[PDB]
Design a protein around this ligand. Structure first.
Ligand SMILES: Cc1c([C@H]2CCCN(c3nccc(-c4cc5ccccc5s4)n3)C2)c2cccnc2n1CC#N
Ligand SMILES: Cc1c([C@H]2CCCN(c3nccc(-c4cc5ccccc5s4)n3)C2)c2cccnc2n1CC#N
Lengths: 549, 546
């Protein structure tokens, strides 16, 4: 195909940065007007309110919906200056403010949206030039449901280009930065959400997760996030770059400052409105009694997946929460899902790139490739025979690299059927393993602390802790439990990795210089058991960070 | 070319079936002689709901119900050839059936593909003979936990890719109403058994109509739920990992209430625990029992398969009764039916050109009831393409199907899967624009002559559309063919006049007295509402059933 250059892509970038620029000015102007009319308002008391209390005061009338809206708008504008997490102000949101149903479970709550959640009259670019100047004709289903519940969606937040990354930079809106440390990634692909919520600029946000994109930015930015079972919530109207891939399910879910916020959001979403607007979603209501249960749990756990070497902080965080759960009366059982390398290298990678990345590469014709994607585009572009040849050469010394490369080759429909059956069988395998140990839930390390900017794209092995559960399609959630100590960070000098390949080398350097950064643990339950997963997340939060409850 | 394995497999299967039937015969004669006072006729004519209440109260023993049905199953098999296997350990499960189970003491027949410990699930294929299952499948386990007693495996057409019912192992199943007619398929044995009174309840599978065809043809009720409403764990199939067109399993029975009871009993903690991949949606009684007037979408023809006069009459009469009962009947036709059938359904079912499917037929006989399926799939891709755009001017149905049965890349499958999602969304948008609750449809009928379904592929149009869409769909008998209806088949031409229309015309003839059904459809996950509508149709068209 003929080389078309980058002139369209450059035009899209100047247009996009203007829309972002204009958005933030409009935000600033709106909040200046409001503050002038309300010098009495205690900004800092309002912003430090846990969502549950914020909701309660909104419902009673103690706080006006305008007071909380403009106070958050101001904070979001402020934190954006150091993070670059906001791409667009949702301009019509002041009308929703007035129209917000007063009996709605999220009445008056400002909500941030990952850019891929289509909002009427706005682009969902995904950092891709071909999506610039293509405004959505309508709000997506979950946005419709949020509005019906009285919430006020107010911003679109940044994503890495195309979203196939756990960093957060694109050629259109640039690079999002961790609020804790500007040299660090906020994670991704829900990076903007993580940065925004993590710095206090949003009480609740929505992201998506197909390889860890809710959990990475939650862990990196010290906030809570939940990835439900793929089809617990509606994907209708969600902007993506590849359609029709059903092997590894996409999921959407809440991100917030406490697990109670995540549970409220699920409860609000799981309503008649959602089940009517999207009939393909099973009408499973939020089961309050499961979430609120105080029964002792049988908790499976592992300190390492034997694939990605945990940092000293990751390992400590896991052991500490394990010990605190034991002290609180729960029974902790060593458990590691079988055949993890297979789940990652052949099932996950093969399921995500069954067509050799051809559909994915279509989005990049005429576009810049953001450095945070590393060599993904270069690799996927290689002919199938060459991918195979390099894989063969790489295999004896670097088995991880060879297996991922082989699984990123195109295949027939016949072989996709075979792969899809293998995913179904693997899912039943881990379920049988789980049931044979009689587990309720599973405790796992969560990748942390935050990697340096532009390193996630060069440390692919590190997705092992998260993508395992996209493959299995188990609800998985993340909660901050500790911070990196000087001792934790110094021990990175001794970090080797299990393979010593390029991915291990990058990761050793990428996790250094992290003293003070948040570190998370991951909570997992069986498919459709979101309430139980949240019950477990609530427990972890209470034991590790009791002030949040 | 060599057929020695296949002949050996058939010899062995036939011996096992003969021995199963002999074991049944001996057990029945023994029970009858020890209990001569039992009114067996009264037992067999009891509606399932009344049967289970007497079982729960102790009025009828599990033994009485079991051996009485076992005897009837043995008798009806003589004329139908619907039973392949006696599930021998059932006599011990009987004595241990959980007392408070919702199906306590109920004998249940099982389509052969439902794995049962110690028995083959052959699918009429040599390669599966003498390979007994080592676990009960999930739904079987759940049935037993609810106190039910699975007692037989019932016949299927070879490989299950057919709405006829013959294989080279156990041979041909016949319609109980008329021996020259097909019982339907692929759950054909279930249709014949239940349709003749030999079982009060059975389980079938459905990916193209395999529950609905035999229910309609044999004059019973059947429901095809949403694909993942129930566990497919332990289900035997000849192709795995195809997800574009959803496979579904569900009950078949004499009345709608029986389907509801079975669904209620399956939708329990035991199921949701044994298969966590199934969304734990309890049976919503309030929805099933609703007496609210319905907005009922309807069509009398899909403009693809010309309905028989009996089909059309059945549809119009139930439409009229629903109108009189106070429901609002709204003309409604899913958009782009030919496209959904010819490219989406055909393309989804055969995305690999039938390669996976064909592996099951190496060294095996090809049953006549499959027609030209195997011969056609074996054709090279370039030749399928060649024949297609040669047939397209003359016979566009045959051309479209042939082109869609070619192998493709993972990339093209993604594209097809995406188009299926979009299509589903487009019908849902249509449904909502008319604000429907429910959809009324014709159901292919009356029963086709033996060995003709394999040559009337176009006739799957009424059924396969709702597998593609993955909407719950059920059938209920509403009428029988009159001689007036039957005579009118002489004026039937079809819309296309291709070989499928020609065969269907002849195949639906000589059907006086045969049952004719209607189809009820709801949105995904709305099985209870589908059953609510089915219950309404049953009440209005056949009130003595309630
Ligand atoms: C993180 C993430 C992924 C990853 C999956 C695995 C492949 N991958 C990636 N990225 C960058 C570089 C490489 C490779 C480099 C390399 C070098 C030598 C041999 C083989 C290879 S593979 N791979 C992206 C992904 C896929 C689909 C959708 N969302 C995705 N996310 C969002 C999150 N979380
Ligand atoms: C019924 C049924 C199917 C059918 C789908 C459509 C294809 N098909 C079939 N059968 C026999 C002959 C032919 C053709 C003949 C012919 C002649 C000229 C040009 C094109 C063609 S295609 N096609 C079988 C099916 C598929 C998968 C699984 N379960 C299936 N069932 C169970 C039911 N109900």
């Amino acid at each position: 195909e003929l080389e078309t250059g980058r002139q369209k892509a450059r035009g899209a970038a100047t247009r996009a940065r203007q829309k972002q620029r204009a958005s933030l000015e409009t935000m600033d102007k709106a909040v200046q007007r409001f503050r002038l009319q309300n010098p009495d308002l205690d900004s800092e008391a309002l912003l430090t309110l846990p969502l549950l209390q914020l909701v309660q005061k909104l419902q009673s009338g103690e706080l006006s919906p305008e007071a909380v809206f403009f106070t958050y708008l101001g904070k979001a504008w402020e934190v954006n200056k150091g993070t670059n997490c906001v791409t667009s102000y949702l301009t019509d949101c002041e009308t929703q403010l007035s129209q917000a149903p007063r009996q709605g479970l999220l009445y008056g709550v400002p909500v941030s949206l990952k850019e891929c959640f289509s909002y009427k009259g706005h682009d969902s670019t995904l950092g891709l030039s071909l999506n610039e100047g293509m405004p959505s004709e309508s709000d997506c289903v979950v946005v419709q449901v949020l509005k019906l519940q009285g919430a006020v969606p107010f911003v679109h937040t940044n994503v890495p280009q195309s979203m196939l990354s756990f960093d957060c930079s694109n050629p259109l809106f640039g690079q999002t930065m961790n609020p804790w440390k500007s040299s660090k990634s906020p994670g991704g692909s829900s990076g903007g959400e993580g940065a925004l919520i993590g710095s206090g600029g949003s009480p609740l946000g929505l992201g998506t997760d197909i390889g860890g994109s809710i959990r990475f930015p939650s862990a990196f930015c010290g906030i809570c996030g939940l990835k439900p079972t793929g089809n617990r919530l509606s994907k209708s109207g969600l902007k993506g770059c590849v359609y029709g891939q059903t092997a590894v399910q996409l999921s959407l879910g809440p991100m917030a400052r406490d697990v109670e916020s995540l549970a409220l959001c699920l409860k609000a979403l799981l309503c008649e409105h959602l089940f009517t607007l999207d009939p393909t979603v099973p009408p499973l209501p939020f089961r309050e009694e499961v979430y609120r249960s105080s029964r002792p749990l049988r908790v499976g756990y592992y300190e390492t997946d034997n694939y990605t070497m945990p940092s000293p902080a990751m390992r400590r965080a896991l052991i500490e929460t394990k010990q605190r759960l034991e002290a609180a009366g729960h029974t902790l059982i060593p458990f590691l899902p079988n055949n993890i390398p297979y789940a990652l290298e052949v099932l996950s990678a093969g399921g995500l790139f069954s067509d050799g990345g051809r559909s994915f590469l279509q989005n990049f014709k005429g576009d810049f490739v953001d450095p945070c994607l590393g060599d993904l585009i270069l690799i996927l572009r290689l002919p199938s025979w060459f991918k195979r040849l390099l894989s063969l050469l790489l295999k004896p010394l670097f088995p991880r690299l060879a297996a991922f490369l082989n699984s990123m080759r195109p295949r027939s429909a016949e072989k996709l059927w075979k792969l899809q059956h293998e995913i179904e069988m693997y899912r039943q395998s881990v379920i049988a393993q789980w049931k044979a140990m009689n587990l309720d839930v599973l405790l796992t390390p969560m990748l942390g602390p935050a990697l340096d900017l532009n390193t996630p794209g060069r440390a692919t092995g590190a997705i092992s802790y998260t993508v395992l559960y996209n493959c299995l399609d188990f609800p998985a959630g993340v909660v901050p439990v500790t911070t990196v100590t000087a001792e934790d960070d110094a021990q990175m000098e001794l970090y080797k990795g299990y393979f010593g390949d390029i991915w291990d080398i990058i990761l050793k350097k990428a996790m250094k210089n992290s003293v003070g950064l948040p570190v998370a643990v991951q909570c997992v339950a069986l498919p459709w058991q979101e309430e139980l997963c949240l019950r477990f997340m609530r427990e972890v939060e209470q034991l590790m960070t009791p002030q949040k409850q």
